[PDB]
Each structure stands twice: as C-alpha cells, then as structure tokens.
Amino acid sequence: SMQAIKCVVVGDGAVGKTCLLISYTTNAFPGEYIPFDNYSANVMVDGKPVNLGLWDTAGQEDYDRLRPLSYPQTDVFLICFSLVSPASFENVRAKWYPEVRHHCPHTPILLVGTKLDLRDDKDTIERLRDKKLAPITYPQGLAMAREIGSVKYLECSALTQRGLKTVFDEAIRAVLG
Numbered sequence: 001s002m003q004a005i006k007c008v009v010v011g012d013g014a015v016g017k018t019c020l021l022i023s024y025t026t027n028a029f030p031g032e033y034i035p036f037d038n039y040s041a042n043v044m045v046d047g048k049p050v051n052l053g054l055w056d057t058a059g060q061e062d063y064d065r066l067r068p069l070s071y072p073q074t075d076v077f078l079i080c081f082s083l084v085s086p087a088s089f090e091n092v093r094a095k096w097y098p099e100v101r102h103h104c105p106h107t108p109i110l111l112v113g114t115k116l117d118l119r120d121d122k123d124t125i126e127r128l129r130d131k132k133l134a135p136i137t138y139p140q141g142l143a144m145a146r147e148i149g150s151v152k153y154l155e156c157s158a159l160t161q162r163g164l165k166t167v168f169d170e171a172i173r174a175v176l177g
C-alpha cells in the first residue's frame with residue numbers, strides 16, 4: 001500500500017495551525033467556521049503517491065499533558081509560529097522545541113512561519129511598532145531554525161496559499177529523502 005507519513009503540527013494558540021491544514025488539504029481557506037482533527041492528504045512525490053496523515057493539536061497550556069499522547073509514531077513535526085507574533089516565535093525555543101524533543105528526540109522538525117501575507121501589512125506593522133516590535137524576518141526565522149536543529153525553515157500563508165504546498169512537500173522529503 002501507499003507509503004504513510006504521520007505529520008504532527010504544533011505551536012501557540014492562534015498561529016494558524018488549523019487553517020494551514022484545511023487550506024492545504026481542501027485548497028480553500030476557512031471562512032466563519034474554523035474547527036483537533038486528523039486530516040488525510042495524498043501527495044505525489046518522485047512519481048509515487050504518499051498518504052500524509054496530518055495531526056492538528058491544541059496550543060494551549062491546558063493540553064500540556066494530553067497533547068503529547070498524539071506524538072508516538074510521528075515521522076515529522078511542524079513547529080509553527082506567526083510571522084506577526086514575536087511572542088509565538090519566542091515560544092518555539094521556550095516551549096515547542098523542548099516539548100517535542102522530550103518525547104521524540106530524533107524526529108525531524110520543520111520550522112514554519114505562518115501568516116506571511118501579513119508581514120508587510122501596514123496596520124500590522126504599526127500595531128507591532130506600538131509594542132516596540134516588528135514582524136519576524138526571514139533571517140531571524142532561519143536563525144531560530146538552526147538553533148533548534150530544524151531540517152528546514154519555511155514561510156507560508158494559509159490565506160493566499162503562498163508557500164503552502166512546499167511546507168508539506170518538504171515535510172515528506174525530510175522523512176523519505
């Protein structure tokens with residue numbers, strides 16, 4: 001049967017984990033309804049179809065004992081932060097990287113910056129400037145990726161779908177080659 005790949009997506013509340021999965025799998029960004037489900041996608045990689053199982057997770061502290069129950073048999077993790085939330089970025093090193101590695105010392109991690117569409121949005125830049133902050137830049141995201149031993153750093157927008165297929169393609173190749 002098809003090569004199966006278990007991919008688990010983690011990161012702070014509101015970084016866009018669920019939208020990333022729905023936009024990727026259905027080719028449509030959620031409207032009013034945003035639903036921690038498992039999505040099943042099929043991907044053609046080097047001429048063979050692959051069964052990508054995608055596991056959504058809750059980012060909140062209340063699930064700190066329950067969430068890791070989904071981790072066994074994971075083939076690759078995506079650690080997500082919003083490019084327009086520096087707090088979510090800091091939490092990659094402070095929370096997500098240590099949690100994943102505590103349970104899965106060897107599983108490849110891809111770092112994904114989300115909400116790419118908002119990085120040069122004026123209202124967003126101004127909002128962040130008021131708190132003495134700025135959107136996370138590509139060099140900064142890449143530096144965090146190296147620091148956490150990630151195999152790849154990617155940026156995407158679930159809303160426009162820019163970079164979205166590449167995230168999951170690279171996820172698969174980190175497992176398969």
Ligand SMILES: Nc1nc2c(ncn2[C@@H]2O[C@H](COP(=O)(O)OP(=O)(O)NP(=O)(O)O)[C@@H](O)[C@H]2O)c(=O)[nH]1
Pocket residue numbers: 011012013014015016017018019020034057058059060114115116117118156157158159160
């Ligand atoms: N502009 C923009 N907004 C986005 C994008 N992806 C998600 N959002 C918005 O960000 C918010 C959170 O998205 P969501 O997918 O629910 O995040 P989450 O990471 O699943 N949160 P949780 O841990 O609570 O379940 C929603 O308002 C959603 O519309 C994106 O690419 N661009």
Ligand SMILES: [Cl-]
Pocket residue numbers: 142145146150151152153
């Ligand atoms: Cl890297």
Ligand SMILES: [Mg+2]
Pocket residue numbers: 017018019035056057
């Ligand atoms: Mg969600």
